[PDB]
Amino acid sequence: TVPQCCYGFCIDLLIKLARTMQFTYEVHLVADGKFGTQERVQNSNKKEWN
Amino acid sequence: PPSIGIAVILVGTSDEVAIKDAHEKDDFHHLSVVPRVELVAMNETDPKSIITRICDLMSDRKIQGVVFADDTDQEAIAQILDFISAQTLTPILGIHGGSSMIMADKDESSMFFQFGPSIEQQASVMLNIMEEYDWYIFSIVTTYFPGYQDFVNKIRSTIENELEEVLLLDMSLDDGDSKIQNQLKKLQSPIILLYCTKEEATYIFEVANSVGLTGYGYTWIVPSLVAGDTDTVPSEFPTGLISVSYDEWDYGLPARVRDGIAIITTAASDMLSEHSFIPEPKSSCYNTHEKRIYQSNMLNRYLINVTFEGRDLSFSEDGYQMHPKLVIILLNKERKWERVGKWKDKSLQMKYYVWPRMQEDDHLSIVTLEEAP
Amino acid sequence: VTTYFPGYQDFVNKIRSTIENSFVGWELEEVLLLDMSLDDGDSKIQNQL
Amino acid sequence: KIVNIGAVLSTRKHEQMFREAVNQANKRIQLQATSVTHKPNAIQMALSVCEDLISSQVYAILVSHPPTDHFTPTPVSYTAGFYRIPVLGLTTRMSIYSDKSIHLSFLRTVPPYSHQSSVWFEMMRVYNWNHIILLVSDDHEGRAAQKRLETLLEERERGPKAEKVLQFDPGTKNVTALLMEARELEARVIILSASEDDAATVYRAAAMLDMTGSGYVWLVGEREISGNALRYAPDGIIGLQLINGKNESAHISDAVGVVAQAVHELLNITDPPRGCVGNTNIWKTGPLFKRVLMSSKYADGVTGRVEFNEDGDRKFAQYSIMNLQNRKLVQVGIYNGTHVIPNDRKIIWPGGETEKPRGYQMSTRLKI
């Protein structure tokens, strides 16, 4: 879990978003790779977007 | 291998002399305690007599854990019996007849159990059957009995990764509307999941004769409770339908009773192996109160986790066998329940090599030499 | 859906082929033919109709 | 062919009053009742359960529920399924014992805490709150009431949002979770369900970060708020007390009006067998007996205007609102069916503000 350097096109678009509708910016990244995936686990095997 | 406090509870018709010779007979060579099973049998099984007999064994001595037997068809009896099991705070499992019948709703501290798979865990074998026929047909028709919404959702998402419709019945009475007749008939799937108790099977199988659920291509599924006693044969219960229950025809309930005896032996395997610290159950009936400060009952701690002697004691959260052994059945033309097969840990073992399924004759039987394209 | 009265098979076939050439996709589901000797508690006409 | 119904509790003044129950029962025939005291233990509960209860052969047996726990109160009644006799949940308001299956039937004229605290969901207009969250201990009855609030949201489908669920196992080493998502809470509406020591750690946790400050609502009942919770907890928190809940007169005369109503509904009635042994199957009379319990609704008892739910509640439930100033409960009103009742006093927040403010507050920092 490291801090890093935020930059890029679409990200910047978001920056433009807060630029229009005023809200302070705070960044995160994706822990896992994916966005979310309905998944049946081994525990209780409940498929959930994950 | 000392003799721990024990009393053997056999209610209903049971193996007495020989199984008695096997009751306390030999614990495994790893047993720091080999308990003495105290043989018990009686005519009247009513808890007023019965529970007085269990707490009467408590009155005599402090037994290690509950080993009981019931030959009746009423599992609710085993339920209130399990409530007693909570009162005693000893571990237990339903071993036979109405006792062995699996059910939910234990207490957070209740170590009473039963031997077998679940509405779910059994319904897994039911899916293994959905493979046994190699067909896509599935749907739901079921009564108002407990586990309704539970096993409902269970099967619902179970294969979610054809499901026609969910027929949910209320048992307050039947309905001459024949709504279940035209709707269940409106379910066309040659295969579907249907779970209930044979008591509820009245208007269900009545409707089955109504819309002809027994015709070639018309088939149903049945629970263990719908499956009823291996001995008892309802007529309206059709042949060949999907069914499963803990296996009677494989071996008697006394088989899993001697096994579960070996489990009561397994109580001190790991516990005695490390802990080995247990107080004797307070013998007084007034122990239902004043013994609250005596000790806390940890028996589940080692109790729940066991796999030994070739039959895994792996159980559910509710305590139903997590590595269960049973038999799926599909009734025969003899007005007897045909052997469908058995899935050991959901491991498929068929009864025969060819399922004799259902005058077009429909049989296209063919062969060829595959040639792309 | 019709009873056992006269003109049964007649008007039956009549309607049957009547729209059979229809340029629109008009749908012909099924023919419920009733016999008037008595009713049937089977509700066969109920669930079928 | 005389009627029979049971009860059990510690104070026998109401047992004599039960002799008055069977006595005055003629108000709308005869009734043959064998009274039973309250067995303090499960064992003795079986002793009289066989002795007086089993041998009763009665039409049905109610039981008073003089707990103050689990299903242990009337656990012998929890074994009455062997009889499968009709019964009325009385002197305990815990609906965990009122569950439909494992517990068979105990008719509760007395509040299930869940549907009770739904009165908060009525107060959704009182705060006019379209948003909220869920905070509770982690338990059976807890998860139950959680499903009840889930029903509250279920009836909806702008709307009364609810954020997330807090459920705590006994004696949490830290509520710092609750503190954390608490920080995550824009709205001020915090649902609360707690046992005694549960609500305790709720209080000890409350000022710990002092997020209990204004802009934080804790919505729960006196069932959570009693005793030590009536002692060390933040005062003025959202709460009420179900009218008559502690009233054994509302209980007794309740059994009078209602138990006499359905008792009258009982009169080819097949009463139970006497011998426990010797009766293998329970009397099927329950089909008319419990359906007669519901279908028979008395006019009104000392429990108030008599009604029921599909589970055979009292329906028609008036609980008295409250707010605690100086660690002192003061009735803020009462609500049953039609009642939205403001009281004289005004109930301030943790701050001086009585009026429920607008909770949700946009936070500038926005992480993505």
Determine contact, residues B350/B341, Cβ cutoff 8 Å.
Answer: yes
Determine contact, residues D94/D113, Cβ cutoff 8 Å.
Answer: yes
Within the 160-179 window of chain B, which residues sit less than 8 Å (CB to CB) from chain C? 178
**Contacts by D152-158 with C-beta closer than 8 Å and gap 24+?**
D152/D118, D152/D121, D158/D130
Q: Residue D366 and residue A27: Cβ atoms within 8 Å?
A: no
Residues in chain D: 368
Residue D352 φ then ψ, to 5°: -60, -15
Q: Is B329 exposed, middle or buried (0-12, 13-18, 19+ CB in 10 A)?
A: buried
Q: Which residue has the tokens 């096993």?
A: B151
Rounded-to-integer distance, Cα D304 and Cα D244, Å: 9
Q: How far D362 CA lies from chain A's nearest CA (Å)?
A: 9
Partners of residue D190 on adjacent β-strands: D133, D218
Rounded-to-integer distance, Cα B373 and Cα D333, Å: 81
- List all residues 6 or more positions away from D246 whose beta carbon is below 8 Å from its beta carbon: none
Determine contact, residues B346/B125, Cβ cutoff 8 Å.
Answer: yes
Residue C32 region, left (φ>0) first, then alpha (ψ -120 to 50), else beta? beta
B-C contacts at Cβ under 8 angstroms: 12
Is D310 in the B-facing interface, judged by CB distances under 8 Å?
A: no
**Contacts by D147-153 with C-beta closer than 8 Å and gap 24+?**
D147/D114, D148/D112, D148/D114, D148/D115, D148/D117, D148/D118, D149/D114, D149/D118, D149/D121, D149/D191, D152/D118, D152/D121
Residue D15 φ then ψ, to 5°: -75, -45
Written as six digits, the tokens of B330 are 């599909």
Residues of B in contact with D280 (CB under 8 A): 72
Task: List residues in chain B touching D: CB distance below 8 A.
Answer: 44, 46-49, 51-52, 55, 72, 74, 76-77, 79-80, 83-84, 87, 104-105, 107-108, 146, 172, 285-289
Q: Residue B285 and residue D278: Cβ atoms within 8 Å?
A: no
3-state DSSP assignment of residue C44: helix
Rounded-to-integer distance, Cα B140 and Cα B220, Å: 10
Method of determination?
A: cryo-EM
Rounded-to-integer distance, Cα B14 and Cα B239, Å: 29
Concatenating the DSSP letter of every residue in B35-81 gives --------S---TTTHHHHHHHHHHHS--SS-B--B-SS-HHHHHHH
| C-alpha separations of B263 from A11, B114, B122 in Å | 62, 12, 22
Written as six digits, the tokens of B91 are 């571990």
Is C17 in the B-facing interface, judged by CB distances under 8 Å?
A: no
Determine contact, residues B300/B91, Cβ cutoff 8 Å.
Answer: yes
Q: Which residues of B are annotated as a binding site for Zn(2+)?
A: 96, 248
Contact C/A (≥3 CB pairs under 8 Å): no
Residue from B175, B179, B181 to probe the interface with C (highest C Cβ count within 10 Å) = B181
Rounded-to-integer distance, Cα B348 and Cα B291, Å: 48
Rounded-to-integer distance, Cα D17 and Cα B92, Å: 42
Rounded-to-integer distance, Cα D297 and Cα D308, Å: 7
Residues of C in contact with B186 (CB under 8 A): 47
3-state DSSP assignment of residue B318: coil
Residues of B in contact with A40 (CB under 8 A): 161
Is A41 in the B-facing interface, judged by CB distances under 8 Å?
A: no
Q: Which residue has the tokens 């509770």?
A: D136
Question: Residue D239: which of D149, D154, D126 has the closest Cα?
Answer: D126
Determine contact, residues D303/D252, Cβ cutoff 8 Å.
Answer: no
Q: How far B313 CA lies from chain A's nearest CA (Å)?
A: 20
Rounded-to-integer distance, Cα D362 and Cα D355, Å: 20
Stated resolution in angstroms: 6.2
B-D contacts at Cβ under 8 angstroms: 74
Q: Residue A26 and residue D362: Cβ atoms within 8 Å?
A: no
Q: Residue B47 and residue D276: Cβ atoms within 8 Å?
A: yes
Question: Residue B306: which of B352, B259, B347 has the closest Cα?
Answer: B259
Instruction: Using CB atoms, pick whichever of D362, D364, D367 lies closest to residue A28.
Output: D367
Question: Residue B104: which of B314, B300, B318, B323 has the closest Cα?
Answer: B318
| Radius of gyration of chain B, Cα coordinates, nearest whole angstrom | 23
Rounded-to-integer distance, Cα B148 and Cα B196, Å: 9
Omega before residue B146 within 30° of 0, cis: no
Concatenating the DSSP letter of every residue in D238-282 gives BEEEETTTT-HHHHHHHIIIIIHHHHHHH----PPPS-STT--S-
Partners of residue B311 on adjacent β-strands: B308
Residues of B in contact with D281 (CB under 8 A): 74
Residues of A in contact with B161 (CB under 8 A): 40, 47
Is D276 in the B-facing interface, judged by CB distances under 8 Å?
A: yes
Q: How far D30 CA lies from chain A's nearest CA (Å)?
A: 56
Is C18 in the B-facing interface, judged by CB distances under 8 Å?
A: no
Is C41 in the B-facing interface, judged by CB distances under 8 Å?
A: no
Rounded-to-integer distance, Cα B190 and Cα B220, Å: 8
Question: Residue D315: which of D341, D291, D336 has the closest Cα?
Answer: D336
Partners of residue D77 on adjacent β-strands: none
Rounded-to-integer distance, Cα D150 and Cα D141, Å: 14
| C-alpha separations of B50 from B11, B65, B92, B132, D76 in Å | 8, 16, 15, 43, 14
3-state DSSP assignment of residue D319: strand
Is B344 in the C-facing interface, judged by CB distances under 8 Å?
A: no
Rounded-to-integer distance, Cα D310 and Cα D293, Å: 11
CA B107 and chain centroid, separation: 18
Question: Residue D350: which of D183, D163, D196, D211 has the closest Cα?
Answer: D211
Determine contact, residues B77/B11, Cβ cutoff 8 Å.
Answer: no
Contact D/B (≥3 CB pairs under 8 Å): yes
Pairing state between β D300-301 and D304-305: antiparallel
Q: Residue D367 and residue A22: Cβ atoms within 8 Å?
A: no
Q: Is D224 exposed, middle or buried (0-12, 13-18, 19+ CB in 10 A)?
A: buried
Q: Residue A18 and residue D367: Cβ atoms within 8 Å?
A: no
| Radius of gyration of chain A, Cα coordinates, nearest whole angstrom | 16
Rounded-to-integer distance, Cα B166 and Cα B159, Å: 14
Is C47 in the B-facing interface, judged by CB distances under 8 Å?
A: yes
- List all residues 6 or more positions away from D78 whose beta carbon is below 8 Å from its beta carbon: B80, B83, D71, D97, D103
Rounded-to-integer distance, Cα D10 and Cα D40, Å: 9
Q: Which residues of B are annotated as a binding site?
A: 96, 248
Q: Residue D41 and residue B285: Cβ atoms within 8 Å?
A: yes
Determine contact, residues D74/D273, Cβ cutoff 8 Å.
Answer: no
Beta-carbon-side half-sphere exposure of residue B130 (alpha carbons within 13 Å): 20
Angle at D107 between CA D102 and CA D113, to 5 degrees: 80
Using N-to-C axis directions, what is the helix angle for B201-211 and B179-186, rounded to 10°? 60
Rounded-to-integer distance, Cα D117 and Cα D135, Å: 13
Concatenating the DSSP letter of every residue in B149-209 gives HHHHHHHHHHTT--EEEEEE--TT---TT-HHHHHHHH---SS-B----TTTHHHHHHHHH
Residue from D48, D52, D98, D102 to probe the interface with B (highest B Cβ count within 10 Å) = D102
Q: Which residue has the tokens 């004599």?
A: D16
Pairing state between β B244-245 and B327-329: antiparallel
Residue from B46, B49, B143, B200 to probe the interface with D (highest D Cβ count within 10 Å) = B46
Rounded-to-integer distance, Cα D240 and Cα B181, Å: 50
Determine contact, residues B344/B234, Cβ cutoff 8 Å.
Answer: no
Partners of residue D193 on adjacent β-strands: D136
Angle at B356 between CA B355 and CA B359, to 5 degrees: 140
Determine contact, residues B329/B341, Cβ cutoff 8 Å.
Answer: no
Q: Which residue has the tokens 């899935």?
A: B343
Written as six digits, the tokens of C49 are 């109709």
Rounded-to-integer distance, Cα B316 and Cα B310, Å: 18
A-D contacts at Cβ under 8 angstroms: 20
Q: Which residue has the tokens 């008007």?
A: C11
Kindly state the DSSP code that residue B348 receives in the 8-state scheme: E
Angle at B13 between CA B11 and CA B15, to 5 degrees: 100
Determine contact, residues B113/B320, Cβ cutoff 8 Å.
Answer: yes
Q: Which residue has the tokens 């039947």?
A: B174
| C-alpha separations of D131 from B166, B221, D351 in Å | 35, 46, 20
Written as six digits, the tokens of D123 are 């107060």
Q: How far D210 CA lies from chain A's nearest CA (Å)?
A: 26
Concatenating the DSSP letter of every residue in D182-206 gives HHT--S-EEE-B--HHHHHHHHHHH
Written as six digits, the tokens of B196 are 């209930």
Residue A12 φ then ψ, to 5°: -55, -40
Concatenating the DSSP letter of every residue in B204-264 gives HHHHHHHHTTTSTT---B--HHHH--SS---SSS-SS-B-EES-TTTS-HHHHHHHHHHHH
Q: Residue B181 and residue C42: Cβ atoms within 8 Å?
A: no
Is C42 in the B-facing interface, judged by CB distances under 8 Å?
A: yes
Residue B341 region, left (φ>0) first, then alpha (ψ -120 to 50), else beta? left
Concatenating the DSSP letter of every residue in D114-175 gives HHHHHHHHHHIIIII-S--BEEEE-SHHHHHHHHHHHHHHHTT--------EEEE-TT-S--
Within the 326-345 window of chain D, which residues sit less than 8 Å (CB to CB) from chain B? none
Rounded-to-integer distance, Cα A13 and Cα A25, Å: 12
Comparing alpha-carbon positions, the chain A residue that sits nearest to D362 is: A23
Written as six digits, the tokens of D163 are 């954020």
Breaks (C-N over 2.5 A) in chain D follow: 28, 68, 157, 267
Q: How far B119 CA lies from chain A's nearest CA (Å)?
A: 14
Instruction: Count CB-CB contacts under 10 A for residue B339.
Output: 17
Determine contact, residues B192/B141, Cβ cutoff 8 Å.
Answer: yes
Instruction: Count CB-CB contacts under 10 A for residue D231.
Output: 10
Determine contact, residues D335/D318, Cβ cutoff 8 Å.
Answer: yes
- List all residues 6 or more positions away from D354 whose beta carbon is below 8 Å from its beta carbon: D346, D347, D348
Handedness of CA D38, D39, D41, D45 (dihedral sign): negative
Using N-to-C axis directions, what is the helix angle for B75-88 and B50-60, rounded to 10°? 30
First to last CA, chain C: 7
Chain B neighbours, 3+ Cβ pairs < 8 A: A, C, D
Pairing state between β D300-301 and D328-335: unpaired
Rounded-to-integer distance, Cα B178 and Cα C32, Å: 20
Q: Which helix (H) or strand (E) holds D328?
A: strand D328-335
Q: Is B230 exposed, middle or buried (0-12, 13-18, 19+ CB in 10 A)?
A: middle
Instruction: Using CB atoms, pick whichever of B49, B80, B286 lies closest to residue D81.
Output: B80
Residues of B in contact with D46 (CB under 8 A): 47-48, 51-52, 55, 84
Q: For residues B101-111, b (16+ Cβ closer than 10 Å) or e, as one string?
A: bbbbebbeebb
Q: Is D344 exposed, middle or buried (0-12, 13-18, 19+ CB in 10 A)?
A: exposed
Q: Residue B140 is which amino acid?
A: I
Comparing alpha-carbon positions, the chain B residue that sits nearest to C45 is: B182
Instruction: Using CB atoms, pick whichever of A14, A24, A28 lies closest to residue D364.
Output: A24
Concatenating the DSSP letter of every residue in D282-310 gives --TTHHHHHHHHHH---SEETTEE----T
Determine contact, residues B116/B100, Cβ cutoff 8 Å.
Answer: yes
Angle at B24 between CA B19 and CA B27, to 5 degrees: 115
Instruction: Count CB-CB contacts under 10 A for residue D286.
Output: 20
Q: How far B206 CA lies from chain C's nearest CA (Å)?
A: 12
Q: Is D186 exposed, middle or buried (0-12, 13-18, 19+ CB in 10 A)?
A: middle
Determine contact, residues B112/B82, Cβ cutoff 8 Å.
Answer: yes
Rounded-to-integer distance, Cα B31 and Cα B64, Å: 14
Rounded-to-integer distance, Cα B149 and Cα D80, Å: 25
Q: Residue D86 is which amino acid?
A: P
Q: For residues B127-159, b (16+ Cβ closer than 10 Å) or e, as one string?
A: bbbbebeeeebbbbbbbebbbbeebbebbeebe
Q: Which residue has the tokens 């307070």?
A: B282
Instruction: Using CB atoms, pick whichever of D362, D365, D368 lies closest to residue A14.
Output: D368
Instruction: Count CB-CB contacts under 10 A for residue D197.
Output: 14
Kindly state the DSSP code that residue B333 receives in the 8-state scheme: T
Determine contact, residues B192/B164, Cβ cutoff 8 Å.
Answer: yes
Rounded-to-integer distance, Cα D116 and Cα D322, Å: 14
